[PDB]
Amino acid sequence: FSVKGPELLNMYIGESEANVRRVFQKAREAKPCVIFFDQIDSVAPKRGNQGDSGGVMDRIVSQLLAELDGMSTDADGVF
Amino acid sequence: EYFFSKNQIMKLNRDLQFSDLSLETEGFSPLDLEIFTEKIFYDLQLERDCDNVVTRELFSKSLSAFTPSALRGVKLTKETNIKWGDIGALANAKDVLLETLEW
Amino acid sequence: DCFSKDNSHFIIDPNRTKLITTNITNRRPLPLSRSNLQRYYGFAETFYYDLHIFPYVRQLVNILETSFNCSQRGITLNA
């Protein structure tokens, strides 16, 4: 699976948070799968810096931290 | 005690009294009970092919494998199966968690 | 007819037989365990599960056969 840089980010408030979850769900459908976060910088910037605005970059990285590891995780074949 | 009498002629064995079972069914609403009794009757009938209408162990063998009729939603993460003996440390936090949430 | 002395077995003749029918009757089908009709007539055979191996099918068959056997018990336990 290719994550085309800041592909996930989106127009509206919550559709980025839907795109991330959809990506992980679909990958989880086929257990031996790979996720290639190319140029992670654009998607997972340092949380809560003063020199930033909008805050969505924080929400998305938080969602990443959640869904990627979280809890109840099983069938770890998702690299 | 009503339900078991009304559905079909059958009874709980002398091994146990209905008060215990009442204790066993915490939070089960009356329709849920109507479902549960039918479930137990089915489990007794042919899932065990015994020619009898009494039960003591079937409840423990099937109550857990049951979903209360109103109780579904965001599915509880009961599969993580982590025992507190796996955590080991964090006494200062373990005790406050156990007293606030568990006790 | 005049041959009423016996009625066990008889022939049907198109020169004498006519098509007459009554209302709809009822009768049980033939269990698969005793005769594979599809096999005989080359139909698209339903897959022959083996209850000793597949877990979930056993539950279904048990439920249905329970509802079948309760006929002579005579109660509305069907679920």
From Swiss-Prot, chain B:
Reported induction: By oleate.
Location relative to the cell: Cytoplasm, Cytosol; Peroxisome membrane
Protein family: Belongs to the AAA ATPase family.
Subunit: Interacts with PEX6; forming the PEX1-PEX6 AAA ATPase complex, which is composed of a heterohexamer formed by a trimer of PEX1-PEX6 dimers. The PEX1-PEX6 heterooligomers associate with the peroxisomal importomer via interaction of PEX6 with the peroxisomal membrane anchor PEX15.
Function text: Component of the PEX1-PEX6 AAA ATPase complex, a protein dislocase complex that mediates the ATP-dependent extraction of the PEX5 receptor from peroxisomal membranes, an essential step for PEX5 recycling. Specifically recognizes PEX5 monoubiquitinated at 'Cys-6', and pulls it out of the peroxisome lumen through the PEX2-PEX10-PEX12 retrotranslocation channel. Extraction by the PEX1-PEX6 AAA ATPase complex is accompanied by unfolding of the TPR repeats and release of bound cargo from PEX5.
Other known facts: Present with 2100 molecules/cell in log phase SD medium.
Domain notes: AAA-cassette D1 is required for interaction with PEX6. ATP-binding in AAA-cassette D2 is required for interaction with PEX6. ATP-binding and hydrolysis in AAA-cassette D2 is required for proper function in PEX5 dislocation.
Protein name: Peroxisomal ATPase PEX1
Curated annotation (Swiss-Prot), chain C:
Top-level taxon of the source organism: Eukaryota
Compartment annotation: Cytoplasm, Cytosol; Peroxisome membrane
Family to which the UniProt record says this protein belongs: Belongs to the AAA ATPase family.
Further comment: Present with 1630 molecules/cell in log phase SD medium.
Oligomer status and interactors: Interacts with PEX1; forming the PEX1-PEX6 AAA ATPase complex, which is composed of a heterohexamer formed by a trimer of PEX1-PEX6 dimers. Interacts with PEX15; anchors PEX1-PEX6 heterooligomers to the peroxisomal membrane and mediates their association with the peroxisomal importomer. Interacts with UBP15.
Domain notes: AAA-cassette D1 is required for interaction with PEX1. ATP-binding in AAA-cassette D1 is required for attachment to PEX15. ATP-binding and hydrolysis in AAA-cassette D2 is required for release from PEX15 and proper function in PEX5 dislocation.
The protein's role, per its UniProt record: Component of the PEX1-PEX6 AAA ATPase complex, a protein dislocase complex that mediates the ATP-dependent extraction of the PEX5 receptor from peroxisomal membranes, an essential step for PEX5 recycling. Specifically recognizes PEX5 monoubiquitinated at 'Cys-6', and pulls it out of the peroxisome lumen through the PEX2-PEX10-PEX12 retrotranslocation channel. Extraction by the PEX1-PEX6 AAA ATPase complex is accompanied by unfolding of the TPR repeats and release of bound cargo from PEX5.
Name under which the protein is recorded: Peroxisomal ATPase PEX6
The species this protein was found in: Saccharomyces cerevisiae (strain ATCC 204508 / S288c)
Lineage of the organism: Eukaryota, Fungi, Dikarya, Ascomycota, Saccharomycotina
Gene that this polypeptide is encoded by: PEX6
